[PDB]
């Protein structure tokens, strides 16, 4: 595992860029890309399902038949399996739409906020979360878009925001090296350098 960047948000939470596996990544948080189904068939989904085990999916599919399908923009919280954390956030990212790039932007806001909202007032107990750049893999959301996106919502939600929760910690995570730097070149266009 390794930290490419690293900046206080405000001055009890810290945003830092990681090259990672989440299925190995220890926080108490790990956020899915997930879709409205919850049906775990491929990329960071698939991924945490194999190593945390079939449960997680079961879990999911229980949540979608007793609360319906999961919009985009919303999340489902379940239990994270053999995993080195404690919840999986299953946050539905957009699939990219080209004529639709002003809707799909927004989509993406409303899931960091979702998630965002579930770590500093549900579970107010949450000290770290890892977040993927969600709908930029197979959902084809554009990197640098969606990687921009994600850190202004973080920034825009946090700065200057009153809370009670014990956040510490948020963690933008991928194990491909383009992601990485993508990451990375948001969070430094937005927060400045590395510190
Ligand atoms: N093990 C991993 N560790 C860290 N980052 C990962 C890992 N696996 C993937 N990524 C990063 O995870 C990020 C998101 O990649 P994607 O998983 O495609 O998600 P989406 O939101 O675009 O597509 C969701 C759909 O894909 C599935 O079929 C779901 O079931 C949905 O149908 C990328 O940056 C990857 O680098």
Redesign the pocket.
Known sequence: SLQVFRKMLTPRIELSVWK????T?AVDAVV????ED???????????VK?GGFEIQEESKQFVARYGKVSAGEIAVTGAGRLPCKQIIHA??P?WMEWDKQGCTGKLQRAIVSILNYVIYKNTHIKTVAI??????????P?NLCTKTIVETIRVSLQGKPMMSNLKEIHL????DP?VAAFKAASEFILGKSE
């Not at 919850?38 to 945490?48: C, E, I, K």
């Not at 993927?132 to 959301?141: E, K, M, R, Y």
């Open positions: 990672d596996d989440l299925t990544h899915n890309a997930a879709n919850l049906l775990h068939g491929g990329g960071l989904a698939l991924a945490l190593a539905v990212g699939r993927p750049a969600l709908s930029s893999g197979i959902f084809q959301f990197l995570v991928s194990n491909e992601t």
